C-alpha cells in the first residue's frame, strides 16, 4: 500500500500519453542536452579505419507531459518506463555497428524530475568510422570523430546541446583506456548543421585526438630493417676472394629485406 501512492502517479503520467509525438510538437523545438562519460576508449583498428568506445550516453530534455507532485522530487525508474515515453532517436553518423548492452537487464536509467525534466542515460559500445590518412605512418596522429544527432527530426524539430560547457561535456574516465598503440591526447567538441536529402539536421561532433606510439614498430620493422642493413655491410670487411660467403651475405639480406617489406604492410590497410 505504501507503493500504491507512487503507482497511481505513474498511471496518471502515462494516461493519455502519446509516445509517438515529441515534446512541444508543432509549438516548440525540443532542446536535448547531452553529455558523454567515456568509461573506456576502446582499441583502434587501423586495418578497418575504426575505433571502439564505451560510454554512458546521457541526454536530458524537458517534457511538460511528465510533470507531477508527490512525496519525492525525482522518480528513479528502470528501463521499462523508457519504452513507455517519448525519447530522442539519436544515432551516430559514423557509427558502424554499436551495441546497447542489456546484461543483466537493459543498461538504461530514466529519472523524471517533478518539473518534467528527464535524464535518460544508457551504456553503449559504439564502433565508429575513423578515416585515417596514413602518410606519416607510424609517426602519425589522428582526430577520430564521433558525430551524432537525430535520425528523423530536422533542426526545426529537435536541436542538440551540451549540458555543460562544451569543453566540460565529454569526460573520459581516468582509468578507462583500452588503447595499446595510441595515446589519447584529448578531445574537442563542436556543433553544426548538415544538409541531406531529408532536410537540415544538427550534428554534435566530438574529435578524439589520438597519437600512435611507435614503440612496437621500432622493434618489429625498424630494428630488423636497421640490422639487416648492418648485416649487408659486414660483407665489406670480408676478403674479396670469399665469393660464396659474400654472395650469401648479399642474397640473404636482400631476401630478408624483401620479406620485411612484405611483412610490414600487413598491419595497415
Amino acid at each position: 500500500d505504501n507503493t500504491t501512492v507512487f503507482t497511481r502517479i505513474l498511471d496518471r503520467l502515462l494516461d493519455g500519453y502519446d509516445n509517438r509525438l515529441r515534446p512541444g510538437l508543432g509549438e516548440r523545438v525540443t532542446e536535448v542536452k547531452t553529455d558523454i562519460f567515456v568509461t573506456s576508449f576502446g582499441p583502434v583498428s587501423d586495418h578497418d579505419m575504426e575505433y571502439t568506445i564505451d560510454v554512458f550516453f546521457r541526454q536530458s530534455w524537458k517534457d511538460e507531459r511528465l510533470k507531477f507532485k508527490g512525496p519525492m522530487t525525482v522518480l528513479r525508474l528502470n528501463n521499462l518506463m523508457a519504452s513507455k515515453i517519448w525519447t530522442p532517436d539519436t544515432f551516430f553518423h559514423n557509427g558502424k555497428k554499436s551495441v546497447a548492452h542489456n546484461m543483466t537487464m537493459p543498461n538504461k536509467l530514466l529519472r523524471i524530475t517533478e518539473d518534467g525534466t528527464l535524464l535518460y542515460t544508457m551504456r553503449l559500445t559504439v564502433r565508429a568510422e575513423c578515416p585515417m590518412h596514413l602518410e606519416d605512418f607510424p609517426m602519425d596522429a589522428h582526430a577520430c570523430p564521433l558525430k551524432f544527432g537525430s535520425y528523423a527530426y530536422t533542426r526545426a524539430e529537435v536541436v542538440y546541446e551540451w549540458t555543460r560547457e562544451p569543453a566540460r561535456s565529454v569526460v573520459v574516465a581516468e582509468d578507462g583506456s583500452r588503447l595499446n598503440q595510441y595515446d589519447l591526447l584529448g578531445q574537442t567538441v563542436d556543433s553544426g548543421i548538415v544538409q541531406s536529402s531529408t532536410g537540415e539536421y544538427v550534428v554534435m561532433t566530438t574529435h578524439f585526438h589520438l597519437k600512435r606510439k611507435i614503440g612496437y614498430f621500432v622493434i618489429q620493422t625498424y630494428l630488423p630493417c636497421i640490422m639487416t642493413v648492418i648485416l649487408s655491410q659486414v660483407s665489406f670487411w670480408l676478403n674479396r676472394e670469399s665469393v660464396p660467403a659474400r654472395t650469401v651475405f648479399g642474397v640473404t639480406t636482400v631476401l630478408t629485406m624483401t620479406t620485411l617489406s612484405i611483412s610490414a604492410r600487413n598491419s595497415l590497410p
Partner: antibody
Amino acid sequence: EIQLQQSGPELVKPGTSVKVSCKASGYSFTDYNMYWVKQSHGKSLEWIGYIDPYNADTTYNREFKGKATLTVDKSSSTAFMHLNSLTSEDSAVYYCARKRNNFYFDYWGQGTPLTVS
Amino acid sequence: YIVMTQSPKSMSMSLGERVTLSCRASEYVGSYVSWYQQKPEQSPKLLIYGASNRYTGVPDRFAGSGSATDFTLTITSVQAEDLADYHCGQTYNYPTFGGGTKLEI
C-alpha cells in the same frame, strides 16, 4: 518580450558588503542559467559566476571565488549577487545575462553601476 | 582560461567603407565565438553567434566568420549607427571576453 531589470546605481565605502539583484521577466526563469559579468571603465568584460536557478548550483570565476556569492529565489524571478570586502578595484558596472544556449548570451541586464570610495 | 585578443585596438575607417575586426583565441574554441556591440552607456547587444550565424533582428551587413583561433567580424559598409565598441567572447569553456574594439571616423 524578455527583460532583465537590475538594482540600480549604488555607492558604498570600502570594507562593507553590497547586494545586487537581477529580475527576470518573459521566460521560464528556471530553464536557463544566469551569468554575472563585470565591466570596469574601458575594460574587457569579466565573468564572475553563474547559478543554475532550478537547484541553485553555482560556479565562480577563480578570481571572484569567495568575493561573490550567487543566490536565487524561485518564487520571485530574481537573481542576486552579494559582494563582500569591497575595495577601490571593485568599482565597476555589473551586468547579468542568461545563457540561452551554449553559443551566446541572449538577454543582458541594464547594468548596475557600483562605486567604492 | 581562454583569452580572447582583438588585434585592432581602435579603428578609424571612414563611413561607408568595409571594415574588418579580428578576434584571436589562444586555444581551440570551436565555433562558439559570439560578437557583441556595446554603444556608450548601453549593455552588450548580440550580433553574431556561432562565429557565422547572425542573431535575429540584426542588419544583414554584419557577417562573421572564422575557423578555430581566427575569427573576424566584417562590416561591409559601416553606417552612422554602427559606431561603438565591439566585444568578441567564447563560450567553448568558462566564458571569457576580449578587449573591446572601438570604431571611429
